[PDB]
Amino acid sequence: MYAEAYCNMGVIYKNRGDLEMAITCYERCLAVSPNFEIAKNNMAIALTDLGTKVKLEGDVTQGVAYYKKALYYNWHYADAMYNLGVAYGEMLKFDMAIVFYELAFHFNPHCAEACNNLGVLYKDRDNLDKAVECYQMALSIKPNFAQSLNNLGVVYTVQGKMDAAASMIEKAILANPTYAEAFNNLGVLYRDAGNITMAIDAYEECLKIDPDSRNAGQNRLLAMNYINEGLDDKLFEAHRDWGWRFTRLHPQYTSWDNLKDPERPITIGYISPDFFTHSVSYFIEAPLTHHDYTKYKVVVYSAVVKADAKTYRFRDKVLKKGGVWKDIYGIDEKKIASMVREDKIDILVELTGHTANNKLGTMACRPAPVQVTWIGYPNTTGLPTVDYRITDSLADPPDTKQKQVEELVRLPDCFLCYTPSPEAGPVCPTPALSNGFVTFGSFNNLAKITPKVLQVWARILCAVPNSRLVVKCKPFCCDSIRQRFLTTLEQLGLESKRVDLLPLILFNHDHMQAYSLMDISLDTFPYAGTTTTCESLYMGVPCVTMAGSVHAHNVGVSLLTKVGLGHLVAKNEDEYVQLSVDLASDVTALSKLRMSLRDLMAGSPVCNGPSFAVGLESAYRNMWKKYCK
């Protein structure tokens, strides 16, 4: 009857914190008065609070049901929509989440958190402008929001605007000191900016704040890998510490069910998070199309954030050839291990290493008898659980001084196999004849460029008169970086008129054809590029690589030796200079060499598919035979 007393008691209980008594009084009051607007709104508030409390325990479905009931009681309640969107993001239902966050923002403009999360979701789908404007609106509502600032820094780092990203990241750091993701992202930006010391200092601070930060430590090892000259071994100790901590942090499986018979078809699962237009994809294009599917079964574990045309064609080839394609995006590592075990897989090959969106969590438990890393992260994995790694004799000489935590297998010919792009197109003749001077070109990452490389390149330019230099890098999208690089080059005694810094090219065939203007390709050291060397050799421009005592330093040496140009490798910097001078001496030899290298690489073992496939299958058979005995 008297619903006023019931609602007053319910309000008192809610303020006191008793949800059951309050919800009972609220229920009875609404039964007495079905159209009590204030009572209905308070009922919605109480149900939202109860749903949040339940979601604290972990019952997602019950919280969602309570939220839906509250929304039914009050359709235009914003916090309910926000909670629904958060839950839908948790359950990986992205479209419903987008809709609900947008509705929450429309109803309540003052919900900056919803806008920030919407920007996050849009950025996860490579909608850069939408994320930028979402974060800008978040700043418009709450200028002092740390998460929005950090994610805007992420987006600007991806876009290449390093100065603004650095400014905003520093603003976030000074806003919140106990916030490590800002340190990690500052250091990521520093690494992509071409300087390493402050990047290492940054992740060191980050690890001090967060001892158990996986991303921070992993990228810290990656950053140290850049400046490894092969003289010190503290990097090995850091890798060992990372591996031991990671192993002690996660459980492992010691049970196996695979048959002990060494004579049976092998299930090979290629697990990789980057099957889109990535360097790795190129080198995986041929083997998948070249395996004996009947003799060896093939499965794919793709964690790609966004599938592309290459992903679709790979899926078509796998399914047509008798394979299984699976998507593992947005799944916890434990579920990944469980599904891997339940798939009766024999061997697994990971192609990520300590890189973006890696899946070392799978290796945390060793779900399969054999796990091997083959391409990504040329340096040692550092995990004791990881058993073996794939390499050759050239990049890894038997007398190497590079200690490895895991055993190595030397492939007969090489462990690289490049695949031409379908629309690569013809190669234009040597432009030296048109312009009358040599134009050295480098299409490597700025992070691989070091002061030593700059000095060597300056010596190269000064050695031969009338020499041009062209460099293509993403960080050459900002004027400040360009000015700093030009000033650094001039400090060594090089004019700025002979330097051409170019930005990225969105269209792949344009990037492929951009090699037409280059004459001689020069590789950076110590962390020498791998895909760039093959890309250059395919277009006919000669490539020069310096040797070294590290596997990554010798990748280019191995590639050049295999393709048939082993005479184009210099052991020391001085020999590099003399080789470059000899190359620049004559133009006709360079021209006809450019003409021949196309067919030379076509007929080389590098481009041979069936032979490499047979060698790799024999390697797998030997691996399984060793496991059986």
Q: Tell me the CA distances in angstroms from 165 to 128, 172, 453, 535, 595, one per residue in order.
A: 14, 10, 27, 31, 45
| Alpha-helix runs per DSSP H in 322-423 | 333-342, 360-363
Calculated CA dihedral for residues 500, 501, 503, 504, nearest 10 degrees = 80
Residues 256-315 that bind ligand GFB (CB under 6 A): 279-280
Residue 444 CB, shortest distance to ligand GFB, in Å, is 6
Binding mask 438-477 for ligand GFB (x = CB under 6 A): -------x--------------------------x-----
91 binds a second copy (CB under 8 A): no
451 binds a second copy (CB under 8 A): no
Which among ligand GFB, a second copy, none contacts residue 506 (Cβ within 5 to 8 A by kind)?
A: ligand GFB
98 binds a second copy (CB under 8 A): yes
Residues 29-68 that bind a second copy (CB under 8 A): 34-35, 68
Distance CA 187, CA 150 (A): 13
508 binds ligand GFB (CB under 6 A): yes
Q: Tell me the CA distances in angstroms from 140 to 263, 289, 320, 460, 565, one per residue in order.
A: 66, 52, 52, 52, 59
- Six token digits for residue 126: 């490579």
Residue 152 CB, shortest distance to ligand GFB, in Å, is 24
127 binds a second copy (CB under 8 A): yes
510 binds a second copy (CB under 8 A): no
Distance CA 478, CA 578 (A): 35
Out of 90, 129, 233, 586, the residue judged to bind a second copy by CB under 8 A: 129
Out of 151, 185, 530, 558, the residue judged to bind ligand GFB by CB under 6 A: 530
Which among a second copy, ligand GFB, none contacts residue 95 (Cβ within 5 to 8 A by kind)?
A: a second copy
539 binds a second copy (CB under 8 A): no
First-last CA distance in the chain: 83
505 binds ligand GFB (CB under 6 A): yes
218 binds ligand GFB (CB under 6 A): no
Q: Which residues contact 448 (CB under 8 A, 6 or more apart)?
A: 226, 524, 527, 528, 529
Name beta bridge partners: 438: 467
378 binds ligand GFB (CB under 6 A): yes
Instruction: Give whichever of 106 and 208 is closer to a second copy, judged by the CB atom.
Output: 106
Binding mask 146-185 for ligand GFB (x = CB under 6 A): ----------------------------------------
Give the burial class of 19: count Cβ atoms within 10 A of its Cβ; 0-12 exposed, 13-18 middle, 19 or more buried.
Answer: middle
Out of 99, 158, 175, 454, the residue judged to bind a second copy by CB under 8 A: 99
C-beta separation of 88 from 114 below 8 A? no
28 binds a second copy (CB under 8 A): no
Give the burial class of 307: count Cβ atoms within 10 A of its Cβ; 0-12 exposed, 13-18 middle, 19 or more buried.
Answer: middle
The H-or-E segment that residue 501 falls in is strand 499-502
Give the burial class of 269: count Cβ atoms within 10 A of its Cβ; 0-12 exposed, 13-18 middle, 19 or more buried.
Answer: buried
Q: Beta strands 499-502 and 296-302: pairing type?
A: unpaired
Out of 49, 102, 163, 201, the residue judged to bind a second copy by CB under 8 A: 102
277 binds a second copy (CB under 8 A): no
72 binds a second copy (CB under 8 A): yes
Q: Tell me the CA distances in angstroms from 145 to 115, 178, 294, 368, 430, one per residue in order.
A: 12, 14, 56, 44, 55
Instruction: Give whichever of 101 and 525 is closer to a second copy, judged by the CB atom.
Output: 101
User: Which residues of this chain interact with ligand GFB, rule CB under 6 A?
Assistant: 279-280, 375-376, 378, 445, 472, 504-506, 508, 511, 529-532
